[PDB]
Every structure is written in C-alpha cells, then in structure tokens.
Design a binder for this molecule. Structure first.
Ligand SMILES: Cc1cc2nc3c(=O)[nH]c(=O)nc-3n(C[C@H](O)[C@H](O)[C@H](O)CO)c2cc1C
Ligand SMILES: Cc1cc2nc3c(=O)[nH]c(=O)nc-3n(C[C@H](O)[C@H](O)[C@H](O)CO)c2cc1C
Ligand SMILES: [Ca+2]
Ligand SMILES: [Ca+2]
Ligand SMILES: [Zn+2]
Ligand SMILES: [Zn+2]
Ligand SMILES: [Zn+2]
Ligand SMILES: [Zn+2]
Lengths: 524, 524
C-alpha cells in the first residue's frame, strides 16, 4: 500500500501572526496559537518524518486582518511560498479586490498551482487570465502522481467582488468531466480541493465518481475524532465518511479557520488508487510548538508597515462619533448608524434587474461597539481609532433570517431594557418602534424593513414568513449576547469581511462623514 | 473737468454664452441676451467713442454653468483677457475650488490686476500667493491715474471653500488705510471695486473717506434711472447716491448678474479728484447688439469639450431615480432626497467647535424636479441626464428663515394637496408629518429639524422664533411656486452653486448612489 499524508489549511483569513485562542489579537504570547511561523515548524517536522506529503489550502487566505488591508495578498503569496504549499483552491474572499486583485499579488507570484475547475471567463479577461488558475494539477509525489481538482463556491458573486466577466458553474457539473479526464491520463489518485462549504463537500464526495478525498473549507467546519483539544465543538468525526454513489467510502475533511489547526489525514491507497484506509485529526497549533525563528523574524519585519499604516488618516468626521455604552446600549447612536451603513456598503454586489441590491438590512449589538471617536483631532480617523471601537477581531456576515426570527431578535434587544446590556440593536435598513410599557416579548410595536426586490428602496412592514438577508456580526450569528434564536433559526450563513476593514473602507470612500441620529429606533 | 466712463460687470457666473431673458439656456437665438461675444461688441463700440474708459469686474465670474465645471476658470482668464478688463475684484465664488483653484487658472493667467484689500494669508500660503492679488492698483487713464481698491465679502468662509489659511477682514477696517495711503501717493481719484453686496457697498460709500465711486456685486442688485428695459425691477436709481460722513455725494453702482447688462457710469472729476457729476445706466445686452464674430467663433471652438463632457459617465445609480411628478409632487421621492443630500454636501464648510456644520437643512419644490433617471443604462448618470432633471439654470442658495416662516412654507406645501402642483416640498435634515384631514394652513402636525449647534446631529422640534439656515433653489428664495412668505420674510440670502453642478459633484464623489424613500415626509 502507498501512504499519503495530506496536510491542509482553509479559511486562514489573514491570520499571519499568532492569535488568541478565539483567533483575535494575541495578548498573552505564552498562550497564543496559530500563525505562519508556528505552522512552518509543524509542517517542517512532519515533512522530516513522512515521505509522501502534500500541503494543501482550500481557499480564503485573503481578508481578515490589517495584513490583507496593507499587503493586499502579497503577504499570502510570500508566506505560502515560504511554507512551500503544494496547491491552493480559490475561495470566495480571493475575489474581494476583484479579479485584478487576485491576478496581481497572488496568481502571478504563487510558486504553487492555484485551482478552480468551475470558474470560466469571457471576453478579453479570458485571454488575460488563461492558465493563471487551472482546473486541476497532477503532482508528482515520490514515484507516484496525485491529481488535485479545485472548486469554488457557486455563491461567490453574492459573497465577494468577482465582477461580471467570470461565471461560477455548478461544482459537481464542472468537476465530473475533469475527474473523468484524469482517469484517461492514468491518474488514479484524485483529491478534490475546494471552497464551497461542508454540505457541498459531502455532495461532491457522494456524486463525483473517482474522487478519493475531499478537502474543503468556507464553512469553518471543525471535525475531530475523540476529545476536542480546545473550545471548538466538532460537527462530526475527522474524517467525515461519505458513502459514494459508486459504493466507495470517501473521506471529507476541513480544519476550522484562522490557522488555529493544521489538518492531518493519512490515506492508504492500493495499486489501483482505491482508498484502503483513512485516519487523522487536525493538530492544534498551540504554544507547545515553537514559532520558527526565521519566519517569525520576517513576520516582524513585515509588521513595521502595518504599525505605520495603523496611525495614518483614513478620512475625517465632522461629528462626534458616539460609540459610548450610555448611548449605544440604550438608543439609536450615530456610531451604530455609521457601522451599519458601512456594512451595507460593503455588501453592494453585481447589478441585477430583480433587486437594487441583494441585501438592504443590518443589525449590530451595542455591546459590540466599544469606544467613541472624538472629532476634535482635526477630524482625523485612524485604523487604531477603529480598532478601539471594534476590538474583537470579528466579521460582518451575511445571514438569511425569517421575519419571525428577526421579530424575536428585536424583542430580545429590549427584553430587560435599562441595565446597559449588550443585546440592544443598532440598525440599518430597519425602522423599529418599541413600547417599553408592554410585557417583555411584546415590546416591538412597529418593524419596517427596506425592500430589496424594488427599483426604488422604501420601507414596508416586516413579514413574519418572509426570509430576509441581514448583515450582522459573526458574534450574533453564533448566538452571542443571548441571540440564541439567530443561531438556531438562520437559514444561511456566509462569513464576511473583517469588521474594522469594512468601516475603514467606507470612511476612506466617503472622505468626510457626518452620521446623524435619524429615527431608525424610536420609543413610544 | 476730466470725464471717466466706468464699464462694469458683476456676478457673470459662467454665462460665457448668450442666454434666455431669464439667464437660462438660450433657446430662441434671435431673442437671446448677454454672453461675452455680445459684450465684446458693446465694449469695443464704447471704447471707439469715449477717450477715458475703465472696464471693471466686481467678482463672481466663477460658478454657474458647465463652462466652469469643465474649464475651472481657464475660460474666465481667456475671455476676460480677450475683452481687455482693466481690473477685477475677488468674489466669494472665486474660492469655490479652494485657493489652488484660484491661483491656477485665474491669478496666474489674468492679464489684469485682481484685487482684494481685506484678504490676508498666513504660513506657507502667504509666500505662495504674495503679489498674485493686490489690495489696489493705480492705473493710468489718459494723462491721469485712477486708484482701484478691492474688497471681498467677510462672509466668504460660509459661502465658498477658501480654506483655513485665509482671513477675511472687515471691509471698512481694511479699506480705509489703503485709501489713505493712495492719497499720500498723489492719487485723488479712487474707485472701490468689490464683492460684499449692495448693503455693504452703501456702508463703504458712507464711511470710507476718499472713496469717489463704489462698484459692487454679490447681491445681484439691479439699479436703473427711468423705465426698466426688461423684466428686472430696480432696487433704486442708477447710480444710488450715498451721502458720505465727509459730506460728499458718492455714487454706488451694480449691474444685476449673468452678463445680461453692462453697467455704464460717466463721472466728471475736478482737478482735485472730487466728483462733480455722475450719470448713466446699465445697458441691456439684447439681440439688437451683434455677437462679435471672432469671439463667437472661439466660444464655439471651446464648446466642443463641453458637449463631449455632457455625455460622460459622472457615476452610477443602482436604484431608479424617481423624479416623476406623480411621486415628487405627492410624497417623498428618492430623487428629491438625492438632490437635498447633494445640497447639504455642497454646503459643508470649515470645521468649528460651535457646530458640526453651519447648515443642516434643505427644501426643494417638487415642481423643480423635471425628470427621473433610469438606472438600466448600466447605472450610468451623465450631466445631460441631470440637465433634464434640473433644466432651469438655477442655483441652490443659502437663506436664513425664522421657524415661523418655515412652518408657513410647509403649510403652503400641502394647502391644495392633490392637484399635482409644484409647491410640494422635498426635504433634507427635516422630518415633517402632515394630516391632510385638517384645514389648509393647519395640516403640519410634526416638524423636526436636524441640529447644527451639536456634536452629534439629531432631530428636535422646530422652534417658531429660532432662525434656521436652509439651502433651497433660488426660484423659492425669489417666491416662486407661491412661496411669497420665503421672499418677504427671509433674513439673509446668498446665491449658491449651479443646481446641476451641485448634484454632479455629489454623484462623482459618491461613485455609486442608492437613495431610498425613508420617512422624511409622512402622512397621518
Ligand atoms: C469575533 C468575536 C466577537 C466578539 N464580540 C463580542 C461582543 O459583541 N460583546 C462581548 O461582550 N464580547 C464579545 N466577544 C468576546 C467573547 O465573548 C467577541 C469575541 C470574538 C472572538
Ligand atoms: C432659475 C430658475 C428657476 C426656475 N424654477 C422653476 C420651477 O421650479 N418651476 C417652474 O414651474 N418654473 C420654474 N422656472 C420657470 C420660470 O418660472 C424657473 C426659471 C428660472 C430662471
Ligand atoms: Ca482513485
Ligand atoms: Ca477723490
Ligand atoms: Zn472563509
Ligand atoms: Zn469562504
Ligand atoms: Zn454671485
Ligand atoms: Zn457673490
């Protein structure tokens, strides 16, 4: 039997530096986790021990910290090249800076193949991008070869900025003919590496004949066999076994997000390329693994421009930005309005005749707003200032919620009003009126929402049975501040851009901001 | 006696081409008026006949048409140089593109002195601008000399974009020592040429000892002796005689605006430079005066780039821009919200600790909105498109109104609701609620306005006795659409930027717009 060790990362999301256990900024260095220097140490160790190793990334290196804001993917090429990745699939966030922001910094500088079989280009872009990403690559491993076939979320147009010159095809449709073609080229060991989420990964393992292993991402899925080593709760065993339509057992793996774990799967293959066995587990990259000194010194050299950037003027405010708790946990606050307006601006996606924009609505817990910004520094706003407002290292995510769920959230928002609790909601594209004299759970007396399926945006009453797209902090999507109803009832969730970066980009675009308190939230 | 002919213009406001009688676009060429080609013919005729002539401009050549949008003052230098102006005073609108937009295109290219005695600079700007404008110039006229001493509105910081490196001093304070100095230099014939408005011009004639003549502007004041030749109604005789503190009669002149008239004043001086007599009248530049063929051909050559510019993309809308009458004469319309938001953005002026901005409020009659803009041309918006929405050639002016006056305006807005009349008001920084079941004059049931004297903008009830700054179309300032109360009760009025240009600049700055109907106007 021929044994392959697959090492894999996904959804690293700009966590170049080691992080806290929750993937936010490292504060107590002695307990920090992840980062590329630590990953380098672990990968190097494994490569000393195991003859046949592949190191794969399932996409979404782009977007997540000030590293991506400043270096715009140059950091991803540089540090993935330094760790000698063997292949990467394109993720949705690889399109955040458009096609031009993918071609240059990443496709032109990577020393490893970048893969997606279900993305096609037309017109002059097709010539410009031809060959810079591939449907698959056949890689030599020892005296054998392994085919790696890539895929990217069909939903990428709603979740990034790929432009109107790329088409994202159904994954299974696109993959099958490529996997069949590899068989004709005497390639009997095939890995599907891609970025569509655990549910689609299971469908690909079931339906794409010839796929031996699926290495996925997007959904930040944690899988583990045994007692978990940290706070993440497994969604299933590692690997997750799918029974294929052809009767085979096909392992499906993912490794959470944020570079906290290195996925590690050992596969035994027979001579015909059938999987005989699979076993492994993600490895927690904790402080018991030393950061590689050479990688750490280069990280520290690259950090200098980040530190300089953090104190530069992004734009100006002519108004006090009221992020005080006394305001934002009790009533509409202009900092809340600013952040929700930035959230909706970040989620403007491709023009379509059925909606002016796919999403119009935003909620933001007042407990997520942790500082005001004074306008009396010549109006200046810096990244440092925004990091005090939004200190938790989160994302502004896209969810689908029934109106009933959103009514429950707004009831929760005021269920114990008056104690300066974090659940009070700031909003955009929503007009709410409370009557605090009513019983808890029955305090929402008006709730109107901005249409999407309309050429002129206007407010209509919320419909309990209708599904709404909402932009909200990942903390709330995950049921933080008691919003268990959002976690338990949401119909779709896709992780969005870094919180600070969403606001910084909006401020830079607007140049001079002056958010008002305007009646989005009223009391009767 | 030594006789001087003073020819003067003021507040030409980018009317390079001949115009309709109301200073809008020329449609029936055979009845059009003004324009620089026609002015050239008249000035040339007078200079053939009169030995001692000065041609003076009292400021505000900048701002008013697509000529200024495209050429940014290069057109003013070129065509004022072609008409051989002898001197110009700086107006407030000469600061619309900041100091840099005055230095280059106008101060560096004019072949005549540009004057203001009451503007001082500090820091490195003082070195950069030194000598490029002057407090006064002594000009040879025949065998005599005439001193021309300039001045500019003290209010210019509120009415343009001069920046924080220029100080506008009290006019009379600044002028007196310069006029005294000219006396010491044996200059006994002194013209004060400046841009502060008729009321200040009368104070300068009264109080500045040694001033022989005041040539003013800013207030678009029409003065005439006898039957007026067109539709403008005189504010007084031409010249307006002020009795000075020293006992002299001092003529004050102005010549309306828009290049429709050439001011013409004949002065007789004795040997000591005392005015013995003054008489004249503005000359209507109507179609009985031919356009100079050479100037007209150069105007037609320069028009080519204007025509090309008019169809270029300014920005994009992802929403239908609903400027239909069926919407904007009956209810809040998103085109109205867009235009009022552009009006407030245009009037963001220098940061101060007593207000986030000096003005927060906007009204716009629905009768002034004359087209929608469809978003289905790839979202494109062009200047041509905006000219269909705003076809009348107006300005968005700054006024001061008691709250009582504004309540009367909002009552007027709905006094005969339901007939698709033009008086219905679109708004910004104002939230109004009507109850149409109430009697006409008593239909406004809530009227809240955005604070200015506040660090966080928020809405408070309108106060009947408080004075509010409001941005509104000059049509309304002049009592159009039945708003006689605005005309009769306003406390201050300053003419603002070209309507189309205000919206085009906002669209360009924003790049992608998506104005909503959001509850600024409600019915109960
Ligand atoms: C991404 C993320 C977001 C968080 N947001 C909040 C928050 O809004 N309020 C809070 O009290 N703690 C918050 N925390 C701290 C934990 O509960 C957050 C932590 C993370 C990692
Ligand atoms: C500057 C200006 C603005 C005008 N605005 C309007 C208007 O809002 N409604 C109208 O019916 N006519 C209008 N007219 C036509 C005249 O009444 C306007 C004309 C000018 C010169
Ligand atoms: Ca196989
Ligand atoms: Ca004199
Ligand atoms: Zn991701
Ligand atoms: Zn993803
Ligand atoms: Zn003017
Ligand atoms: Zn003026």
């Amino acid at each position: 039997p021929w044994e392959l060790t697959i090492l894999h990362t996904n959804d690293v999301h700009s966590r170049l530096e080691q992080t806290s256990e929750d993937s936010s900024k490292c504060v107590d260095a002695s307990r920090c986790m992840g980062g590329v220097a630590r990953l380098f140490t672990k990968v190097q160790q494994i490569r000393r021990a195991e003859p046949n190793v592949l190191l794969l990334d399932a996409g979404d290196q782009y977007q997540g910290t000030i590293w991506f804001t400043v270096y715009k993917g140059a950091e991803v090429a540089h540090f993935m090249n330094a760790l000698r990745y063997d292949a990467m699939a394109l993720g949705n966030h690889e399109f955040d800076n458009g096609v031009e922001g993918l071609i240059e910094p990443l496709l032109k500088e990577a020393k490893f193949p970048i893969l997606s079989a279900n993305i096609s280009a037309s017109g002059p872009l097709a010539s410009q991008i031809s060959g810079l990403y591939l449907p698959y690559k056949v890689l030599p491993v020892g005296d054998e070869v392994v085919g790696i076939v890539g895929y990217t979320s069909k939903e990428t147009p709603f979740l990034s900025n790929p432009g109107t010159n790329l088409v994202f095809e159904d994954e299974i449709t696109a993959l099958q003919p490529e996997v069949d073609k590899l068989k004709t080229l005497n390639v009997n060991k095939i890995i599907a590496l891609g970025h569509s989420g655990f549910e689609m990964d299971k469908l690909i393992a079931q339906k794409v004949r010839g796929v031996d292993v699926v290495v996925g991402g997007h959904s930040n899925t944690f899988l583990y066999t045994g007692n978990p080593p940290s706070k993440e709760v497994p969604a299933g065993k590692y690997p997750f076994i799918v029974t294929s339509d052809d009767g085979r057992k096909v392992p499906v793996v993912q490794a959470y997000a944020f570079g906290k774990y290195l996925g590690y799967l050992k596969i035994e293959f027979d001579e015909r390329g059938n999987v005989i066995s699979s076993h492994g587990n993600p490895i927690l990259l904790d402080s018991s693994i030393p950061e590689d000194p050479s990688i750490k010194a280069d990280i520290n050299k690259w950090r200098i421009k980040l530190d300089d950037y953090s104190t530069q003027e992004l734009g100006k405010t002519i108004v006090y930005l009221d992020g005080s708790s006394q305001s934002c946990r009790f009533r509409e606050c202009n900092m809340g309005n600013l952040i929700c307006d930035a959230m909706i601006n970040n989620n403007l996606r491709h023009a379509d005749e059925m909606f002016w924009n796919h999403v119009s609505m935003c909620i933001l817990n007042g407990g997520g707003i942790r500082s005001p910004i004074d306008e009396r520094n010549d109006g200046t706003i810096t990244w440092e200032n925004l990091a005090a407002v939004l200190p938790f290292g989160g994302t502004f995510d896209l969810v689908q919620l029934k109106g009933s769920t959103l009514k429950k959230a707004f009831e929760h928002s005021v269920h114990r009003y008056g104690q300066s609790t974090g659940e009070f909601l700031q909003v955009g594209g929503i007009h709410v009126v409370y009557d605090l004299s009513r019983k808890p759970g029955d305090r929402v007396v008006k709730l109107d929402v901005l249409c999407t399926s309309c050429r002129v945006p206007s407010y209509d009453p919320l419909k309990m049975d209708e599904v709404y797209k909402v932009i909200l902090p990942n903390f709330l999507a995950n049921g933080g501040d008691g919003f268990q109803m959002i976690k338990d009832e949401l119909l779709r969730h896709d992780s969005g851009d870094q919180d600070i970066n969403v606001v910084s980009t909006y401020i830079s675009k607007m140049k001079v901001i002056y958010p008002a308190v305007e009646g989005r939230i009223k009391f009767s």
